[PDB]
C-alpha cells in the first residue's frame, strides 16, 4: 500500500509554492494564439510585438489572480471552502464588472 | 448627567462665560460639578479666568474646583490668566496653589505668554459601577456575575471605554491587555478578595483598601484630576513583527493611552521629525524625554540593538520598556 497524502495538503503545498514564485502560469503559445484569434475578430492581418503579447499575459494573469482572491473571499463568506461559479459572479458583480 | 449644548458647555460653563454671579452661586449650591469639561477641555475656571471674572473665580475655587487641571492644548487656568493679563486672577490662583511651573504641549510656561513686568515678577519664583474581569476562571466569573446581578451593575467580557471596575485574580496587577487598558483609562483595579468580600458582607464597601499601590493608583489619581493621559505628546512607530504582544495589541494600547502611532519611520535628520515641537507632559521635568518624544518600539526577540539609544529626537525603545511604562504609569528613562 503506497504512501498517500490527505486531500488538501498538496493544495496548500501548491498555494505556497505559487505565491512564492513570480513566473507566468499560463502556457505562452496557447495564449498567443488566443490573443491573435480575438485580434482577428477585431482587425484583419494584424501583427503583434512579442512585448505586446507578454504585456497582455501579465495583465491577464494579474487580473485572474485578483479575481480568484475575491472569489475565495466570497466562498469563505458562504461558509465554504470550495469556490463555485456563483462566487465568481458575486465578486464580479460587486466589483462593477457584471451588473 | 446634566444635558449640555453642542459645544459641550454645561450650564455652569455658560454662566462662567456670561459672568452671571447669582447663576453660578445657585448652580454651585445645587450640586453642579465645577470640575466638568466641555468638548475642547475647558473647565468653568478656564472660562472665568480667560474673561476676567474675579468673583466667579473665587466662588469656583471655593467649591473644590481644581486649579491645576489642563484644558485644550494643555493650557492651565494660570495660562489663561497670564495670557489675557489679569493680575488679580493670577494672585488668587497662586494663593490657591496653582503651579507656576506647569507647561502646555508646546512647553511654554505662563510667563512665556506675557510681557508685563509686575505679573511676570508674581509668576516668577520669589455614575453606575461597571465591572469586568481579567482572565478569571469559571467560579470566579460566575461569582462576579452574581455580584453584578445582586448590585444591579453591568458586567462586560470584552474591555471598552465605559468600564469603571476591573478585577484581577492575583494580588499583583496582571500584565494582560485587560489590566493595561484598565490602568491607562484609569479604571478601578481591584483584587479578587474584594468581590467575595461584598458577598461576605452584602455591602459596597470601601475600595481604597483594594487598590494596588504605585501601579493603578497613580493612573486613577491622574484621571480623577482630569490631567492628560500617560503618553500625551508622544509618537510611536512600531518596527518589525511582534510575538509576545501583537501589533494590534500595542496599537490599541498606544491609542487608548493618549499617544499617536506613526506610519513612517522617524528619520532623525528629517524636517518632519525635527519640527515636532510638542512636549510629553508625564516626563521627568528636566530629562531628555520632554522634547524628545518620538519612539521606535522594537521587540527584544527581533534584537535590533542600536549603536545609540537615542539619535536626535528619536529613541529606540524595546517593547519591554513600553510594557513596563504602562504597568507603572510612568515614562521610565532609557538612559
Amino acid at each position: 500500500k503506497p504512501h498517500r497524502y490527505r486531500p488538501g495538503t498538496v493544495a496548500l503545498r501548491e498555494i505556497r509554492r505559487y505565491q512564492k514564485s513570480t513566473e507566468l502560469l499560463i502556457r505562452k503559445l496557447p495564449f498567443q494564439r488566443l490573443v491573435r484569434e480575438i485580434a482577428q475578430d477585431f482587425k484583419t492581418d494584424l501583427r503583434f510585438q512579442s512585448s505586446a503579447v507578454m504585456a497582455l499575459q501579465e495583465a491577464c494573469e494579474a487580473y485572474l489572480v485578483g479575481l480568484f482572491e475575491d472569489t475565495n473571499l466570497c466562498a469563505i463568506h458562504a461558509k465554504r471552502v470550495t469556490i463555485m461559479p456563483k462566487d465568481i459572479q458575486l465578486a464580479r458583480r460587486i466589483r462593477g464588472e457584471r451588473a | 448627567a446634566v444635558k449640555r449644548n453642542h459645544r459641550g458647555e454645561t450650564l455652569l460653563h455658560i454662566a462662567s462665560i456670561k459672568g452671571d454671579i447669582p447663576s453660578v452661586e445657585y448652580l454651585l449650591q445645587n450640586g453642579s460639578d465645577p470640575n466638568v469639561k466641555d468638548h475642547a477641555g475647558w473647565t468653568p475656571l478656564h472660562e472665568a479666568c480667560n474673561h476676567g471674572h474675579l468673583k466667579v473665580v473665587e466662588l469656583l475655587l471655593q467649591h473644590k474646583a481644581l486649579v491645576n487641571t489642563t484644558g485644550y492644548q494643555n493650557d492651565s487656568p494660570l495660562h489663561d490668566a497670564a495670557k489675557n493679563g489679569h493680575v488679580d486672577i493670577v494672585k488668587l490662583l497662586l494663593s490657591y496653589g496653582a503651579s507656576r511651573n506647569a507647561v502646555n504641549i508646546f512647553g511654554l510656561r505662563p510667563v512665556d505668554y506675557t510681557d508685563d513686568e509686575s505679573m511676570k515678577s508674581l509668576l516668577l519664583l520669589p455614575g453606575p459601577l461597571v465591572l469586568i474581569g481579567s482572565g478569571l476562571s469559571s467560579e470566579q466569573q460566575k461569582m462576579l456575575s452574581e455580584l453584578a446581578v445582586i448590585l444591579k451593575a453591568k458586567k462586560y467580557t470584552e474591555f471598552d471605554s465605559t468600564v469603571t471596575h476591573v478585577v484581577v485574580p492575583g494580588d499583583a496587577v496582571q500584565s494582560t491587555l485587560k489590566c493595561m487598558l484598565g490602568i491607562l483609562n484609569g479604571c478601578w483595579i481591584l483584587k479578587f478578595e474584594w468581590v467575595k468580600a461584598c458577598l461576605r458582607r452584602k455591602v459596597c464597601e470601601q475600595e481604597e483598601k483594594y487598590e494596588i499601590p504605585e501601579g493603578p493608583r497613580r493612573s486613577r489619581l491622574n484621571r480623577e484630576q482630569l490631567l492628560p493621559k500617560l503618553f500625551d505628546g508622544c509618537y510611536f512607530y512600531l518596527w518589525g513583527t511582534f510575538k509576545h504582544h501583537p501589533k494590534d495589541n500595542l496599537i490599541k494600547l498606544v491609542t487608548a493611552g493618549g499617544g499617536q502611532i506613526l506610519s513612517r519611520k522617524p528619520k532623525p535628520d528629517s524636517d518632519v521629525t525635527q519640527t515636532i515641537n510638542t512636549v510629553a507632559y508625564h516626563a521627568r521635568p528636566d530629562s531628555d524625554q520632554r522634547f524628545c518624544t518620538q519612539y521606535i518600539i522594537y521587540e527584544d526577540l527581533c534584537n535590533y540593538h542600536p549603536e545609540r539609544v537615542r539619535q536626535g529626537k528619536v529613541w529606540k525603545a524595546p517593547s519591554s520598556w513600553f510594557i513596563d511604562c504602562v504597568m507603572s504609569f510612568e515614562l521610565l528613562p532609557l538612559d
Binding site: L25, L34, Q40, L56, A75, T82 | -
Partner: protein
C-alpha cells in the same frame, strides 16, 4: 485563414495554478469554463482598445505601448513595458 477554439488552450491545470496563487484550496468543477468566459471578456476589452490605438497611429503592428495605454485607460496600470 482564421483561428478558432483557442480559449480551450487555457487549460484546467493553468486555471488551478492561477487559483493557487490566489490562495484557493478547493475548486469546483464548473469554475474552469466560467473562468474562460471571464478571461475572454477581459481580453476582448483590452485588445479592442489596443487595436484602436494601433489604427490611430496608422500602424499594422500592435506594440507594447498600445497595450499599456489600453490597460491604463481602464484602470489597470502596468509597470515594466514602457510608459
Amino acid at each position: 485563414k482564421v483561428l478558432r477554439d483557442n480559449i480551450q488552450g487555457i487549460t484546467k491545470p493553468a486555471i488551478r495554478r492561477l487559483a493557487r496563487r490566489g490562495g484557493v484550496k478547493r475548486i469546483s468543477g464548473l469554475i474552469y469554463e466560467e473562468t474562460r468566459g471571464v478571461l475572454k471578456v477581459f481580453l476582448e476589452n483590452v485588445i479592442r482598445d489596443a487595436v484602436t490605438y494601433t489604427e490611430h497611429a496608422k500602424r499594422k503592428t500592435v506594440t507594447a505601448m498600445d497595450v499599456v495605454y489600453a490597460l491604463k485607460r481602464q484602470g489597470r496600470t502596468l509597470y515594466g513595458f514602457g510608459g
